[PDB]
User: What shape does this take?
Amino acid sequence: PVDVSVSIFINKIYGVNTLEQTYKVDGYIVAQWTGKPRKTPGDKPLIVENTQIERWINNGLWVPALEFINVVGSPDTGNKRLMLFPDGRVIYNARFLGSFSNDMDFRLFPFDRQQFVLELEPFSYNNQQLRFSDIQVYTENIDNEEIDEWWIRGKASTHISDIRYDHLSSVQPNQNEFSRITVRIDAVRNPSYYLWSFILPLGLIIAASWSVFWLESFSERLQTSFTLMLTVVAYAFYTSNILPRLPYTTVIDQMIIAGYGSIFAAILLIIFAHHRQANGVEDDLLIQRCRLAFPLGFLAIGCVLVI
Amino acid sequence: PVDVSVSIFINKIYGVNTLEQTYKVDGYIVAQWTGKPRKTPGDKPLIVENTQIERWINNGLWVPALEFINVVGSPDTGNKRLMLFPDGRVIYNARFLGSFSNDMDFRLFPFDRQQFVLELEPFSYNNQQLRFSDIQVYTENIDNEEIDEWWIRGKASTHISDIRYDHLSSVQPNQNEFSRITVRIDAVRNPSYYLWSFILPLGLIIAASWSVFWLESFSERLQTSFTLMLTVVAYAFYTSNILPRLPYTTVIDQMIIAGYGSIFAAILLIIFAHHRQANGVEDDLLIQRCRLAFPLGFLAIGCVLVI
Amino acid sequence: PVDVSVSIFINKIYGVNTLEQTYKVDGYIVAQWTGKPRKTPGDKPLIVENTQIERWINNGLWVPALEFINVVGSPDTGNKRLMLFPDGRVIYNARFLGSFSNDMDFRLFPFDRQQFVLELEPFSYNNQQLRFSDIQVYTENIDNEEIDEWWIRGKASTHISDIRYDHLSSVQPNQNEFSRITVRIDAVRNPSYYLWSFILPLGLIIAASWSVFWLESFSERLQTSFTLMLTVVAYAFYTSNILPRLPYTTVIDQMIIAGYGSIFAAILLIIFAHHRQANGVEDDLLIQRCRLAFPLGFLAIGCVLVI
Amino acid sequence: PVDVSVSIFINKIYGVNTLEQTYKVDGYIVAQWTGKPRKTPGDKPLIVENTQIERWINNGLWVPALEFINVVGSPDTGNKRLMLFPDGRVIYNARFLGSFSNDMDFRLFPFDRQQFVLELEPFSYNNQQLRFSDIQVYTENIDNEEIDEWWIRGKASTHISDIRYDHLSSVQPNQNEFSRITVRIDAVRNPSYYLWSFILPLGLIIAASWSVFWLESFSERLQTSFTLMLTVVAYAFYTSNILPRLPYTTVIDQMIIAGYGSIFAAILLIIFAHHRQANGVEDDLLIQRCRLAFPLGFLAIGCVLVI
Amino acid sequence: PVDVSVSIFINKIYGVNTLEQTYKVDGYIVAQWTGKPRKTPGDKPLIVENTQIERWINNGLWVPALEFINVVGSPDTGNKRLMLFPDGRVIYNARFLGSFSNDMDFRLFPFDRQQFVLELEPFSYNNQQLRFSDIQVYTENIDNEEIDEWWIRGKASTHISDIRYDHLSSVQPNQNEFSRITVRIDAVRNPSYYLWSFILPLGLIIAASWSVFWLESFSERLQTSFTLMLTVVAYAFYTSNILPRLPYTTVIDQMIIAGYGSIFAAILLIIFAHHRQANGVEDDLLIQRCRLAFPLGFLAIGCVLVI
Assistant: This one.
């Protein structure tokens, strides 16, 4: 197996789409191996630009095609360079831009912690023909920098593994294991924007929903509760286009359903308080001192869902 | 007819657009057949990378073009590989990414059950020249996994059929039947997000619309009903962009029209109750005890439309 | 002139954009003509796949370029096939996907009746060099089927005409007439979705706007009218993105302006009724019995605009 | 300098994006010049289709590259044709589709009057090598037709000018002037849709905002004014996505700010009227007869801003 | 090292996306250097159009590939020209259109001041093989012009630097420094649109929120405050799609949170004023004279956040 040494340089990470769970990565890839010796002009290495590698491959040069596994669409490749050394080593440097997809579990959505993953693998050559020696990821541009609301924390984790492909077993009987490289970059979401734009006004609106019990008219209590219900329905509008449709509920979604439940429970309590009239003369004194009990219970529920 | 054995490997299924009834499938296709024997370097099979298959096809190698029938746009093909064996068998391995379209009937929209279908067919060779022997679909990455709100349940169903094309009858008189492969993957939608985000708050709002009959002022009853009508009109806004424009009505659409009907019926009942004054002195006692009759009738209607 | 027989097969019609007046058509085109006799391998016809037609055209084969006239953008062509027969006839089969644009007049917008038109023409050869003999359109997949809200009714109308191009008169003095083929497919919009989602709730809201005259307080009448005005302003929001910006008004637009006029007229009538107080003591008895006159007049106006 | 005669035929103008100030133009371009005589098959002109012009250019034929100056992106070129005449004249006919950008000043936005401009220029040859003789624009399909809300009025104005490029002065010392052709098509926007959809309901809402002074309760006056303020805030929502973000204010924007000013001024007047109580007993008689003075002043202001 | 002189001409800057921090730049690039002397036809320079440079590069001509560093996606290149002079100098003129990304810090968002940056670098040749001599940027079309809300103020700053690349150290031991050119264009945002569309109506609405203390009914005060809370919640809707999700707060965002705080503080003050009843008889006289104290404090806070 030919030993190929890969070096991935990340120019920038951008376009992190949480709705589609994709992210755009731009960078360079440098794959270096050793072949048969050749005579270059002088002792200097020979540089072959893009659309001139085709002539050398037609002449019979072995240049493998290293594809990206977790990419969405054909990765937009830029310029490509081939350095041929007189001692025999061949270096392939290419510029890639790709939309890559990862798992991205959004349980703690504003306080999220994800990893951007690049998977690289030969398309045609198994580990009995091509083997990855080592990889160094030069993530120096985005080392500790803020790509939007994404603190790229730490360095890049590098892994070389072997993947047994089963659909190639019928065409390659006992040799269908491919060498793979995984690059993992740990990122933390910046929660500030959601903290001052989605969590704080919803909390104020839920407190204002608690404020319906300080009125002295049941009909005005219902009208106030319905206006605040309309306000909460006005929310979760521009919340639905900040995260995808997940089976589970996040902090902002729990706060939206908590506001709905608080408003419907306030409506139910005032309806039952007016229903509590035994003979049309009993007023509401014990049942409407929940101005300091309903917010206390809601704060206890919020503490339970937070922790 | 040359017997071609196809193996389709599905890397991921993503981008399931319910509005356009398309879905993006990425994977590999391995078509294997047998031709005339040839002399490769050594006894080892010869691997021909992408843009080097053109030279072999120009020399006269028979490589058929297997197209996708139900694809939307030209399928973005990645790397392609040609394994030539000394015994004579030729293997063509290609990476595809395509937007595929299927029927996708949305009667039970949150509790939906669809199938993703891949149709594969030779473009030029009929069943008297090319015949598909068998297909194995290696759907191991998405075997039991949750692509968004889509439980990929079960394995993949595989079918080989013959399609008689009639527009090719004039150019091919009695031989216009093409071998086709259909791959069907059964998927179930995850109903949780719609259950806690679209069905529960609409149900609470419809209950709050029932709550208008507990007031003691007809004018305030009308004002409350109009505010709740505005709230229901605020709904069906971000419901219209979750499913396409279908001729029939789904569960969420039936609940929206049921809320509209409940609010308009409440308005009609309170208008008729104030109209029920025979001489300006008759109040509303029998006609306004529908606080436990109107919700009961609505629950019966909801049970009828559910089952 | 070489006689070319064209056969167009429509796989599917999809993506009918009413806002841009475009629609995506996928299918196959089979152009058949007769040239000089040639010697193929055996007596069997020779099949030339895609990117192998270039060698035959370089050798000197006459293959015309049939373009689409009413297409938006370069039509995404898939695989192309060239059947060469020993008797001399040449057949060109290509797979196309194109965004085609038509007139699409939207006077009766929910109950609309349009036709999807495909125009095909040689790019370079006039009718003194290439002439279309006949066309058969094999619209069998979408014969009587429901592409979204579009009942494809009937068969396909086929026409061959001659178009005199004037910009080519200076370069071709008396021979600038090009043979053209027009394919017309009649389609009817499915009005059900708009009937239960845009027309019915607007009608209920306009009836609820009539319901303001049953109140017994002028100030509450104004407040109710302003809330219902806000509800109608909440409508025409997700109506503006279902059809383009047309100079004329459709049924839904007439209903929106009719709701605006009904609400403003109700406001004007209640303002004038309170203005009708001659000395501060005259109430409203004759002028506020329009609870059965204003809806009657609005229904008459709706009957006039419907028919 | 070689004299090149250009003829531009416009098939359709569509996709006029006011937000991005671009518009899509599809058509044909016919550039005709005269070179050295050549021997074609017979005395008939020789037609060279697309991807066969490359062989003739490789053999040494002079075919200039005429680019579009004001285009956005690479113009999608379709089929291209080369007519070679035995007398020596060469004709190049190409089909283009391009997104072109123009100035598009939107002062009178619904009653707008713009011009669509196509600029054409050789990429490499200055006026000492290539010179445009004359241009005829055959705008016969869109002569007097309604591309959406765009009355294409009149014919096309044609201009040939010389542009001195300064960045090419260092590489071409005294010869850096390029021949350019400008095509201008005058278009008028159809104001009907905005007239019945954006101007009329806003005017009705502003009249309804004047209608707050006919109430007999200051608190109800404030509540009514705040509801109408909410209605005006509901407007300018789907007005913000019909025109770009311009430094100046258009008619619809002036009407929106006029509605805001009318509502805030009504609030200020009723607040000052209740503040006008000298000792808690003075009512509002002189200050609240502005039901025919405030609308008169607003109509005067609207007449000033209209003319 | 070969000395390359670069001249960049900017045709237009457009499509400045603040949400994605990208901007589209269209222009020409002219790279001029000197090589070995060659014999052209006559003493005149030889012009090589696009897709004819490939033959000269195949013959062995040295044409470097100058890439853009801060570009998003492959830059759409148009026509390319190669001027070969008999004295030996080679000139490469290409037309580029690219989406370029810059930092773009949005602290003072309506009154913003950014710079559009173009970074240019050889892909393969270090400073021991290619060195940039000087660059002149001919920004004459957009010298003092208004690209949308972007006053392009001043001229273009030009810089030539050396960048040490570390991922190329293993393949190039002591020679991994690349010559780079940075072009910086200073631009100022036009604040007018936000001034009359987002800042002025929000300020009027906050003043109207101050106007709740002039009422004489606590229940009506709460209802008015909740309606105005709904109006502020209606704002920040079409504010969220004018700037990206930034960790910090801008002027418009501070005004939105200031309106939320003013409304919640007004609610809290009126609740506490009604709570201030010691024995059910004490009214509100001292605590409700904040009609000229609460606006004064809010104006002081606005002055603090402005400066």
The helical segments of chain B are 53-59, 192-210, 218-234, 251-275, 294-306.
